[PDB]
Paper text:
Pyruvate kinase isoform M2 (PKM2) converts phosphoenolpyruvate (PEP) to pyruvate and plays an important role in cancer metabolism. In contrast, PKM2 has low basal activity and is activated by an effector molecule fructose 1,6-bisphosphate (FBP). PKM2 exists in a dynamic population of monomer, dimer and tetramer and its pyruvate kinase activity relies on the formation of the tetramer. Upon formation of the tetramer, PKM2 can adopt the inactive T-state or active R-state conformation.
K422R, a patient-derived mutation of PKM2, favors a stable, inactive T-state tetramer because of strong intermolecular interactions. Different from PKM2Oxalate or PKM2K305Q, PKM2K422R adopts a T-state conformation in the absence of FBP and an R-state conformation in the presence of FBP. Compared to PKM2Phe, PKM2K422R has two additional hydrogen bonds between residue K422R on α15 on monomer C and E418 on α15 on monomer D, which may lead to the dissociation of helices α14 on monomer C and helices α15 on monomer D, and therefore strengthen intermolecular interactions (α15 on monomer C and α15 on monomer D) on the C-C′ interface to facilitate the T-state tetramer formation. The strong intermolecular interactions on the C-C′ interface in PKM2K422R may be difficult to disrupt by PEP to form an R-state conformation. The above structural analyses support the observations that PKM2K422R forms a less active tetramer in solution (compared to PKM2WT) but is stable in the thermal-shift assay. In contrast, PKM2K422R significantly decreased the enzymatic activity (kcat/Km of 0.2) and substrate binding affinity only in the absence of FBP. In contrast, PKM2K305Q tended to form a monomer whereas PKM2K422R mainly formed a tetramer in the absence of FBP. For example, in the absence of FBP, PKM2K422R showed a significantly high level of tetramer formation, but was much less active than PKM2WT. Interestingly, PKM2K422R tends not to form the R-state conformation in the absence of FBP because the hydrogen bonds between residues K422R on monomer A and E418 on monomer B on the C-C’ interface favor a stable T-state tetramer formation. Thus, PKM2K422R shows low activity and high cooperativity in the absence of FBP but comparable activity to that of PKM2WT in the presence of FBP.
Author numbering:
A (entry chain D): 25 to 126, 130 to 401, 406 to 531
B (entry chain A): 24 to 126, 129 to 403, 407 to 531
C (entry chain B): 24 to 126, 130 to 212, 217 to 403, 406 to 531
D (entry chain C): 24 to 126, 130 to 212, 217 to 401, 405 to 531
Write the structure that this text describes.
Amino acid sequence: TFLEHMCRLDIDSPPITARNTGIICTIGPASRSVETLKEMIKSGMNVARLNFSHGTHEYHAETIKNVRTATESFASDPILYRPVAVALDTKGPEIRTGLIKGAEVELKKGATLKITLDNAYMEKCDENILWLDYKNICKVVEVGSKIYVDDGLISLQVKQKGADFLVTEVENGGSLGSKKGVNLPGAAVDLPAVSEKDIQDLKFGVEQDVDMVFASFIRKASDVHEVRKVLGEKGKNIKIISKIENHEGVRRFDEILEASDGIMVARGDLGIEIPAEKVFLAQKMMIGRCNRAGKPVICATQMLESMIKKPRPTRAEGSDVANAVLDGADCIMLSGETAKGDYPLEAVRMQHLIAREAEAAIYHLQLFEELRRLSDPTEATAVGAVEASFRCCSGAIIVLTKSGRSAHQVARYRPRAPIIAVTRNPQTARQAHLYRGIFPVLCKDPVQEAWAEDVDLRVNFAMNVGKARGFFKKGDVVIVLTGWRPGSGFTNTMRVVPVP
Amino acid sequence: DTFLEHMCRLDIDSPPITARNTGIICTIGPASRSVETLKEMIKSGMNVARLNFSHGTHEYHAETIKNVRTATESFASDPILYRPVAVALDTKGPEIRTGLIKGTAEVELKKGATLKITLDNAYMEKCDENILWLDYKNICKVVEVGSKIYVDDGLISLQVKQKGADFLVTEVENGGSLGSKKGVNLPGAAVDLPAVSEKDIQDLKFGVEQDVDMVFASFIRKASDVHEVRKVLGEKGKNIKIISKIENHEGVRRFDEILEASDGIMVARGDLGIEIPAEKVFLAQKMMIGRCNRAGKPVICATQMLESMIKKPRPTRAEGSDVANAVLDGADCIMLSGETAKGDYPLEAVRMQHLIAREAEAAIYHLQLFEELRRLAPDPTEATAVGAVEASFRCCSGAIIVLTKSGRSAHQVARYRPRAPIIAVTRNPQTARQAHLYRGIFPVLCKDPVQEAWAEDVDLRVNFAMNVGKARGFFKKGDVVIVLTGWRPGSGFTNTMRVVPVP
Amino acid sequence: DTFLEHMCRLDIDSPPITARNTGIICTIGPASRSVETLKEMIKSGMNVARLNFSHGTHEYHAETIKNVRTATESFASDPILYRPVAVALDTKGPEIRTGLIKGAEVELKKGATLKITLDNAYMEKCDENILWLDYKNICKVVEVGSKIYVDDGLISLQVKQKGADFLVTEVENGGSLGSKKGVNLPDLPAVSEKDIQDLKFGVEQDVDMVFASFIRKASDVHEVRKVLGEKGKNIKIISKIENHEGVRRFDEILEASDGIMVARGDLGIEIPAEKVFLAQKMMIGRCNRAGKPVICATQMLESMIKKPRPTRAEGSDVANAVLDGADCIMLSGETAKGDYPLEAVRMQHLIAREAEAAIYHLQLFEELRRLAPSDPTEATAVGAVEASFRCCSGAIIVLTKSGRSAHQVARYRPRAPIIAVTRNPQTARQAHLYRGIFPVLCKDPVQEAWAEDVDLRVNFAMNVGKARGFFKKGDVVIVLTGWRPGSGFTNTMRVVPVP
Amino acid sequence: DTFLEHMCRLDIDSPPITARNTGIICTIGPASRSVETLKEMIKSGMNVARLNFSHGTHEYHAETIKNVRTATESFASDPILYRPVAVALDTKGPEIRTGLIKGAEVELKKGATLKITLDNAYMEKCDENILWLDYKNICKVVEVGSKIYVDDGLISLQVKQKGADFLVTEVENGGSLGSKKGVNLPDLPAVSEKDIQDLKFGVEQDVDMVFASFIRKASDVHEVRKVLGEKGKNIKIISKIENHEGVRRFDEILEASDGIMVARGDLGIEIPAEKVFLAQKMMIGRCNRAGKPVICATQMLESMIKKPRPTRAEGSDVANAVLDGADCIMLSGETAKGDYPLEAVRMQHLIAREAEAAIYHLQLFEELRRLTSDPTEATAVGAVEASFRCCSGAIIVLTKSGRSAHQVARYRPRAPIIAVTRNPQTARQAHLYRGIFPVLCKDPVQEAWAEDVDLRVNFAMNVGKARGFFKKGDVVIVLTGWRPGSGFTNTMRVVPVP
Ligand SMILES: [K+]
Ligand SMILES: [K+]
Ligand SMILES: [K+]
Ligand SMILES: [K+]
């Protein structure tokens, strides 16, 4: 029972399980160097995120170079080599105010504010007529519609809508500077999914051979397909992860999920748009549907922010990170903790520890029996493999895959046993980190002419990796998923093999 | 139908429908001890008022208790709408405390700065940036060089650099604003203070005379600590519930024996974080809540709930998330501290707590709780309790109505955690107040005189329970309720279950 | 724990220590009419006395009923040990029978030629040449190659000439022909003139149930119901399914009836042998689902008509009927006219008790609990059976007036016996139709205080349960009652220790 | 969903669309001896031919075996439609019989007298008074008042006196005392000198299985095993449970046997009639639990010896045996000496097929599943799980000894198990297992292993399509090894039907 699982949790016993959730780290000035990156990889970093909200293409190109230099420095031993994915995080559409002749002119709880659109009234914002770059703001806003300014600092409330201006009352005021960020809860923002700057960044991402794109501010399915279109044919194999940052994204989550390769839950941005007594519900909902759909869900923002200045996180942060894992998140993303903080290596190590500790609180058998309660030969084989992995108490499930799909298919049923995905495709090896329980392995050996010899070679390689990682030892039993004939593109073959 | 589907169907646009089942415990202080404000807190959902005996005199607390009962009984004219309010005494216990600053504000401690700790009573009111006084006289022989000292709920951490015969020289590791009379923790040290001091005895006796409903025993490290508290309360306070506060590592280590000796448990997450690493505290919380749920004893989550509401009218998303997960872990009650005691928005804190708790109810997967609690569990009264919860799921009952004198039979039903609310009908004002400790129990106080005929008296109390249920929106005409009683008057045990239609 | 393991743990060397739960119905005749024999049959386990109204006058049957009640009430001195005995009237129905033979037995020789006359000039001079049967419109509904059966399907004939007057056949096979023997044609009135008289005689004699023969549709049951009328509205109607049409329209027959009797012997005449076991399983299944009694009859222990012990095939066939979910087993000639009626009853008791060891109770309930269609009484019924398993209770005690509440508990098939306590003598007798109900007749006067009267009846059930060995001091039992005097619900459940 | 719903859904006007999963064993005698008749019995559904060595000479049985094989191989020209037919040897065992009748039959009426003699001069003349039997030790195991049954329990006797070389009895139950009839007494050796010779003959005739009569204990089975020896080590030994001791010591017998035959008739004489059904259900359950074949025999369709159709009760008796969980049903006199041997086989086929509709397949499996680190066992379970999950038309198992097909069969999948083998003996022996449909592959071994696997699988595909098990578009489960000549059948493949 799940209750008994909680009762025998022991804080004095070390985590005997391996970490199954991926760790995504934002690379910046504090972690940009090869030497630091090497230690972060050793500490458990699986994906390197590039925040294109700031920095030039030159800067980021150097960062990508350093990440790959640090990564390939472990290639001298393919058994212990861990693939590292590169993630591009788009800037996305913003709503910014004008320049207060910078400086600030405070407001107060009661006064009025006449929002404008005069494209020359930029350089001088008062405590009355305020400017913003959102041209079509007057047809997606209503009367009574709140307008948060500077990350949920100053809330307004529309009173009069002309045709290209708004009269507002200041709900709660304070300091207000230049080029601040405004949020419109819960309006349907009509800004383009792909800014002209995003089109540049995404183009750059294709040339840099990035593995995935974190698309900011996704509100609908058509936004995702717009990013897809920009990536085009050349970037068709790049995984698109939609970032849910506002109320519309939550409401239209199903169409966004069906259009995406994965989901990022941005709690911080969510907390600005919707009340605090509901954000946890939205998180648990979105994670649940991603798990049900077998698509990767990333939990981001406000993970270990205190570790920017401290070597140790608060227990609240540790509890929040742990509960995200227990919710069913596939990956956890660090931001300023690794980008600009004083302890980037400690943050990665702490995230590893918390993820490992939360593993003990996971009730593996229940999740599978529910995901099974919810035709195709590959689906039956995947279910059969997981079922067999519980029956034999297997040390691992070895999946021979080209694109990664066969491994993802097994991963969606959440077996206790780690999934060793063996591939010769370096990209799918890197992209596999997005899925919980998948331990990607990159085979470098040339193809054998005899198909059964090539399979046996890939299996034995996985066998060696498993022994080295301590997943299993000789005498144990593993489940092996392959195809049947040379280049028949569907995994329908399950094999229960003793560990040699 | 499945836990996964249950999570998938969660909707933030949908208004929270079902009632709030977890208790709300509020610490009363300068910001909330007036009759006027107390009335608003009760309206907003306060079930239990906590008296913090770490501060204040007996006449101070007697006034608070009087104000609570005045505010509570102001609603007593309408027994259908009347909500019982419990009074909790939180003992001081083996505390170590600073340390009065000058002549009423604070000083700033900066990183890497030298700070001297003294035991010289000539400095007990002249503490500052350089010298600091505390009341633990044996501190120099329980602490070593390199020992960590935490001040004011772990806000400030110090490291001992030099051991003097009567003093300590420290270096500030974590800076901050030190105030007056703040708590001190010595994680690795073995503090010599007793579980029940002479001051605590005076306080517990005061609690008996003031007819408090429960005692929150601070810093419980073992079973014998609970037996001491139980002993002081004696025969006169034999019905006062004892809640043991787990605040350190030894308390977690010896949790099983403390739980068996106690009536309930309070998990102090904040104090726990001092001795236990951040990557392990959440495990400890889930463990203790689980064993409490298993034993059928109330568990309270306290400290670090809505602390930001001390200065802001709205909590952070992280706080609301942390509160909700405590409820989802299986906590029976949530306790508020500085939010209601001294903060600027005590009314807003209680309302937000009610709002978070109610929203969290939507994420609770009720049937699995019961199905597991029935399979892995250790009596006609017990079989009746299980059967009643069974029927409540089977019939989709609006409520389980339990006619109880001591509250026991209602507690036994609560252990199995039905989805339907448990309306405990009692004529005992004390068990009505104590019932708030248990999740899903909605205590109701019948003041009607005992009817001559027993069956007539039962129907009277059931009719009272159904009126309450209708008024609270638990059920309506045409619904079905489960009723638990004994057989014949003066019956020893509740072994009778009835399925009755709502007229 | 599982069904398979339950079968694996079966032990023929261990005494059947469970109580017999299936009702025993005995056909009373010249071999069992006497008060002495009836007394012993009651002691041996007879629950219901069946009177076959296909033969005998009302004078004869009134005497048989009187003897049954004399034997039954001879045990009334001890209310704790008194077992109620029901009386069943079995109608003749639309029977087609032959005529008497001149002198008397003749042999219908295999391959011969018979002539079915409809003229009353050969009704007393039948032989191997010309045969008479009491059916008129036989030449209005038949082809020239059909089959006709004699002596309960024993002899078979092949019609090869028609017209209107007679029928010319050929003996495919046969044996012996007595006189006025059963004839089968694989639209007589459902309730004939004679049936109406017998049914009204049944109301006058205060019989507990009626076994309606040859029910083919729901309107047949309604007609029987109509004849019984207001005076006999509480009399149970058990519809006998004896042909193919009864099987096809079984659903409407079941809904209209109070119970069902599966006549396997007659069923085999029309339906192929390879199909009858399926029909039996289907009908018993739908009866259990609907919560209505199903009786298995005919071809039970027929060998015991002349022998003191049955064959193993008969024991297996009876046991399987019980294991199929039958509520009652009916004996015919074994008790009516046979040389060992007392041994037949005892053997029936023996087999039914041994078969209980193979009953897997939990699965029956779990499936019924999941299949069953806000009623306080129905919810209490489920909860009581569920609590009986959980507490391993020795019995479920049900205080009932009409028997309905006890019937609702019986539907869920608890392993524990259901002690139905009643003051109504008829409900006590009719309760035997339901598997697992041990009816008990309280004769103590009504106490002034309702609660005290409930305690008295429960206490009476306690004493019966102890004397029967259902439970003992210290055990736990479930008790189902109403809440106040004149309650329309049996919605109150108690878990009470045995005093 | 529920067994109850499954029963309520039974419909007698709906034709049995499913195939017969239970094996049919037929006793061959003077009525079914000919090649022509045997051909019709094979087409009607006979899977196993039983030879009763209680009667007849070796050469008589040698000709029967030749005829059975001539009839079976007449269908060999079509590998896809060809059905393997097993040969079973049923030993005489420790049985005691009566002598010859002077005349011929004499009449023994209830309430008479009878002289049971050891006079060898009266083993030719056993009339109304005198009768001869071949058990010399008869006056050492029978008391005064002991009961004696003759000819399958037809006639019973009461011992009043105990003479020297004879007995004085009292006819308790009447009947017609025929000749060479069997006699029951509710110390003859487990295997006799005759049995030793008969078992040797069985090894020489290459029979597939031995029905060992009157097995009482484990040491009886191993005595038979030892006689069969090295040369007959692959011959299946099925122990016949015919008395109380066999039932009491059933576990040790089952653990020593390859299979079990439940002889209800012989059980009925020894054990009370109100207990035999319990014994039958217990033994079948334990065999199912152990994954060992159980045969229900005796008193099946006896009325079909003289009639073209069975009675209602016999149809219910056979059907309930199938529903009890019996792997095979055996016919005796109905096929051996009766007037309607062909009709007996066809009726047995019809009843077995009709009973199939009453089986809730998922219930048996879910119980057996929870009632291993061994890869072959895990693969076997997984294959059955997949067959339910995919609603597979069949489970194709490539097997050499049959062992792999057997462990899949233990879990009782709804889908037929197509056992593909090149070993003709395992093809014949596979008939003992419920749900196994054996096929004999005759294509020569291909050089490349993956090619030879595909050849065997495609053969199973064509058999399945010809039999109507499945059609193009459906999905089947396939169990194989991984490399040429391997120890474990540990490979499971979910493959579409071309
Ligand atoms: K960004
Ligand atoms: K305190
Ligand atoms: K009749
Ligand atoms: K034999």
